[PDB]
Amino acid sequence: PEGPELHLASQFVNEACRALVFGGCVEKSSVSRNPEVPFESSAYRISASARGKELRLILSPLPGAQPQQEPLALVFRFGMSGSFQLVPREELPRHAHLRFYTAPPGPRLALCFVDIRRFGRWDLGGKWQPGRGPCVLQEYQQFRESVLRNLADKAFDRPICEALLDQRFFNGIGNYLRAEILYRLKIPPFEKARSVLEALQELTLSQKIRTKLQNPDLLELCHSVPKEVVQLGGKGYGSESGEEDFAAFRAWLRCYGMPGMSSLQDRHGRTIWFQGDPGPLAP
């Protein structure tokens, strides 16, 4: 999964669990190799936050809840088939590996982490993945400055398409986004990353409008392009509107997996999509 989905998923969890009160223990499927979740409360709330390709659940016991329980945070990485679903209690998905049950007041619902391929993972604690840079969606300015400040790093010796997948600098950017981003500026996927960014290393609003507005740079699109998907996905995550959502996503794509577009393999075996010249560092 990539940036936008984790953000939309975090949005779905919050709006769905806003008035919901959960109770009991956090159940994990026996087959799952992920860690058990030491947690038990008669009444607790579930909120979510997203950063890059990670989602953080926070379990917060309500005042008066028993037994005594400190708030617990869990960080998730979805993987190929990872997802969060809110389902009726008697209708648990076959591959729900982590479940949260609602308290007696109201219908019996279950917030489940569904993942048939078990590529997903979660870790106890609320700490994000070590070394991952600022979120390109929520922390744009910190993201931009971090990249420019560390241009001398060996990561930018790599071709631009490979550097975009580096979560240490482009946290939230994945396979389809890098294809769409590079396509907008028609930048060859195999140009030296530093070369593409060297020019970017204070203008007034009137000055930015006249020069910077109609000519967005690479880093600007690293934030605005996935932001287009967020405002494309709407409140579709976790709904029955799955079919119509993916239809809008397919129409939004301009390069990735599109007819007429070229495709190569980076050093990681990941397929990069582009149009025209591959670049001086193409294998």
From Swiss-Prot:
Gene Ontology molecular functions: class I DNA-(apurinic or apyrimidinic site) endonuclease activity; damaged DNA binding; DNA N-glycosylase activity; DNA-(apurinic or apyrimidinic site) endonuclease activity; hydrolase activity, acting on glycosyl bonds; zinc ion binding
GO CC, alphabetical: centrosome; chromosome; cytoplasm; cytosol; nucleoplasm; nucleus
Subcellular location: Cytoplasm, Cytoskeleton, Microtubule organizing center, Centrosome; Nucleus; Chromosome
Extent of the signal sequence: none
Source taxon at top rank: Eukaryota
Presence of keyword Manganese: no
Keyword set includes Heme: no
GO biological process, one term: negative regulation of nuclease activity
Induction / repression: Up-regulated during S-phase.
Residues noted as binding DNA in the record, renumbered to the chain: 175
EC numbers, comma separated: 3.2.2.-, 4.2.99.18
Catalytic site positions: 1 (schiff-base intermediate with dna), 2 (proton donor), 53 (proton donor)
Tissues showing expression: Ubiquitous.
Alphabetically ordered keywords of this record: Chromosome, Cytoplasm, Cytoskeleton, DNA damage, DNA repair, DNA-binding, Glycosidase, Hydrolase, Lyase, Multifunctional enzyme, Nucleus
Catalysed reaction, written as an equation: 2'-deoxyribonucleotide-(2'-deoxyribose 5'-phosphate)-2'-deoxyribonucleotide-DNA = a 3'-end 2'-deoxyribonucleotide-(2,3-dehydro-2,3-deoxyribose 5'-phosphate)-DNA + a 5'-end 5'-phospho-2'-deoxyribonucleoside-DNA + H(+)
Recorded family membership: Belongs to the FPG family.
Role this protein plays: Involved in base excision repair of DNA damaged by oxidation or by mutagenic agents. Acts as a DNA glycosylase that recognizes and removes damaged bases. Has a preference for oxidized pyrimidines, such as thymine glycol, formamidopyrimidine (Fapy) and 5-hydroxyuracil. Has marginal activity towards 8-oxoguanine. Has AP (apurinic/apyrimidinic) lyase activity and introduces nicks in the DNA strand. Cleaves the DNA backbone by beta-delta elimination to generate a single-strand break at the site of the removed base with both 3'- and 5'-phosphates.
Designated name of the protein: Endonuclease 8-like 1
